[PDB]
Ligand binder design. Structure first.
Ligand SMILES: O=C(O)C[C@H](NC(=O)CP(=O)(O)O)C(=O)O
Ligand SMILES: O=C(O)C[C@H](NC(=O)CP(=O)(O)O)C(=O)O
Ligand SMILES: O=C(O)C[C@H](NC(=O)CP(=O)(O)O)C(=O)O
Lengths: 310, 310, 323
């Protein structure tokens, strides 16, 4: 992969990432191609030195395994460095405010990666930070880089995004992942059909669906609400994207039996982590893409960091 | 051409840093000049490779945001590395002593950065370590690199340290920052006047004032106590250095209204974190330098690290 | 700095997986790495490679020396912390392994459960290095301990070694006894512990063939007798593993008390007056009161230098695994 170019995505340069609404179809494709080239070079064992002497600081005010780790790994694999700031042993225990904490890490860093239980926390950070801030999850609001890596996953597994039927399953109300993903998909691609599969209490919120109505209508995107993985859903979906019940903010299980109803050419996705909604019996199935999904996330996050800091 | 552009301060080579007392006026000017050269290169986007293959290990037995992070960032910006040792998950929980803990990190590292709630813990660490130890705060004692970066901030903001009138405000008793700062300023500069602004119970300790007796007399420094931030203090001070009540170790509030009495040209400083003593209404004021102070912190710690390890 | 080829791309689980030739090639590579680092040389061997530590229980030396080792090879570290991870959202151990496996070149794993490493092995593609699995094994400890003996005394064959303290729960002495006996011609091993904390059968029995055919003497005592002090070339002593005895049961109370009450195993300056001239005192660390600070000034106290040999052995290991 040594002869592949790594052109940064210019429209991302020096900008904070807060929403899936920020990106055009052309940004996304260009991030996909960049991530793909990142993957090729890293897998061939090539050493990248694009971000030498640039610092990423993670500001994680809630738990994370994948998002924290992929961002760190992505930064390192670009030749960058990470300052390992941790909230629990910080000067917040001395009474420091969220705003002063952002200002503090912003003094040392080239980019901040921020996750916070309050939906409004990243606007607050944005209002005081000089350097780009990447939204790693703002309460039940959004998770725009998950959306990007999820789309990368779809494109690499199935070969296209236009024309798919996708089921978003589980806690759609509190799932910031499915908020960002639906936005990113409906705004930039010709989705055929979206199954919104959730108990009534946990349906996709109105504040996500409504701003999309113009695009849903002009592109003819079919939106179908269910409360179960019916036979129809199992048989038409090219992607089953399922989610964890977001317990910390307070049928639909996929197992191998349920999987014998699925199409030959489809993928099962989950942003992770999972509880019982997604059975380990599915893990050996080639259509299980939720592990590969995590590796795609590192390479997308490399495409993003390089584009922001180039 | 490092030895022209970033000459290390030779006097610091291979030595621990424990007190503001160990530095001459010439050391401080050499560090300031090296620090602002660090700043010039980093701000222009130049990558430093001075300390590749060298390791800094933080040993923080109390909370920190600024001191930990700026040391980690400074190390990284010099091309060096950090081993992220955390006290809370260490073999101290198996009953290891402080001395054994120090020998352990001393075995792997080139330099240790230590913050500890006990005043004598730095001297206990020195009696066993082979490599330099940088005192990042020892109980209510001293914070010597804070005094260095505070002095860089004064010099860079105002142009001069000789001849200033400075107010040290808040919890002067337990304020390890004002202990070191007063030492550093009075031993090496001809300060016109110091205001110590605190009720008697939180006044500057006698063990700080007494040993400065010779310098106070020889340079004719004026020193007054007040119990409040009076109009006279407001109108005469070039530097308002304010501090947090160190609650964990047991009117003077600056706000926009009080700032209406300040000189047109002066700075408000605070080593941070702040509580109610320094109102956010001050933040927009050009004289508010307590955010820029954090960034000088990084560059001073670059100058220090490079000098210790060159 | 030639990598030891047998280690390439392989997980490290047990002291049993190494040959004599493996051990000497690691020793020589470790000592070659020490030469260069001490001379101030910078190594770029693993630039762009990532090590992720997965520690589910406490560590100072193993965690820090793996990180430092990785760094001094030019490699990098992703500082994954269990306490603030998605484990709190209910993620299983398996799914945790697969997660960090997606980003890393090698995982260094310590877990209070003996079978956890094997479970990690069954899901991960990249090599896993056992940094301690319960009271089970600590394979890189045994390797660095052997480097220490070799560097300090000059030779491993022919030694008399006392293994002292909590031998029941001591994963270090488990790995070390296997490594030594499988691959060296040991003259004598003193198993010095109270009965309640003696070396387990599941360690000794698989070694019995080698013990017998090599004619290795095994002597059990519950004290540091004159005989042990005068004969031993190495006194390898251990901490009582209190955390393996947190049940509040009578079985646990008896085991915990026996360390001091049913044995006489403290090493202090007075005791060291009985030791030979050419020998070393070792301890994987951390220590409590079983190894007195009055021994620290003795040239025969090797337990601090042992930590430094540890960093160099771990460099030789990481480089050999990842080359
Ligand atoms: O938490 C979830 O279930 C989904 C989603 N998960 C992630 O981003 C992965 P992690 O929490 O491991 O970073 C999130 O919004 O945090
Ligand atoms: O804590 C204070 O208020 C003053 C001073 N503050 C600092 O050093 C900044 P930090 O605690 O963020 O490193 C200290 O002595 O800790
Ligand atoms: O814990 C002991 O007493 C011996 C042994 N110690 C070590 O490995 C050193 P550590 O805990 O510092 O990494 C262990 O098995 O953890």
């Amino acid at each position: 992969g040594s002869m592949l170019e790594l052109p940064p995505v210019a429209s991302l340069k020096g900008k904070s990432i807060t929403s899936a609404e920020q990106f055009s179809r052309a940004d996304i494709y260009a991030l996909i191609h960049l991530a793909s080239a990142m993957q090729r070079k890293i897998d061939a064992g090539e050493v990248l030195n694009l971000l030498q002497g640039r610092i990423m600081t993670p500001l994680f005010f809630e738990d994370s395994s994948r998002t924290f780790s992929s961002f760190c790994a992505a930064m390192i694999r670009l030749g960058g460095s990470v300052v390992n700031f941790k909230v629990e042993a910080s000067s917040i225990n001395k009474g420091e405010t969220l705003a002063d904490t952002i200002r503090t890490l912003d003094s040392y860093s080239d980019v901040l990666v921020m996750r916070h239980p309050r939906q409004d926390a990243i606007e607050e950070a944005l209002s005081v930070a000089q350097h780009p801030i990447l939204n790693a999850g703002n309460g039940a609001g959004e998770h725009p880089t998950q959306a990007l890596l999820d789309t990368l996953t779809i494109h690499s597994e199935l070969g296209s995004v236009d024309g798919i039927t996708i089921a978003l399953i589980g806690d759609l109300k509190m799932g910031r992942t499915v908020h960002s993903l639906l936005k990113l998909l409906v705004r930039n691609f010709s989705i055929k059909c979206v199954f919104l599969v959730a108990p009534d209490a946990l349906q996709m919120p109105q504040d996500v669906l409504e701003p999309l109505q113009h695009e849903i209508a002009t592109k003819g995107v079919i939106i179908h609400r269910t409360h179960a993985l019916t036979d129809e859903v199992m048989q038409k979906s090219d992607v089953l994207y399922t989610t964890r019940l977001q317990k910390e903010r307070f049928d639909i299980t996929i197992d191998a039996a349920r999987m014998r109803l699925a199409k030959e050419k489809m993928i099962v996705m989950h942003p992770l982590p999972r509880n019982d909604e997604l059975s380990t019996t599915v893990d050996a199935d080639p259509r299980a893409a939720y592990f590969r999904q995590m590796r795609y996330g590192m390479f997308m996050r490399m495409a993003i960091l390089w584009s922001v800091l180039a």
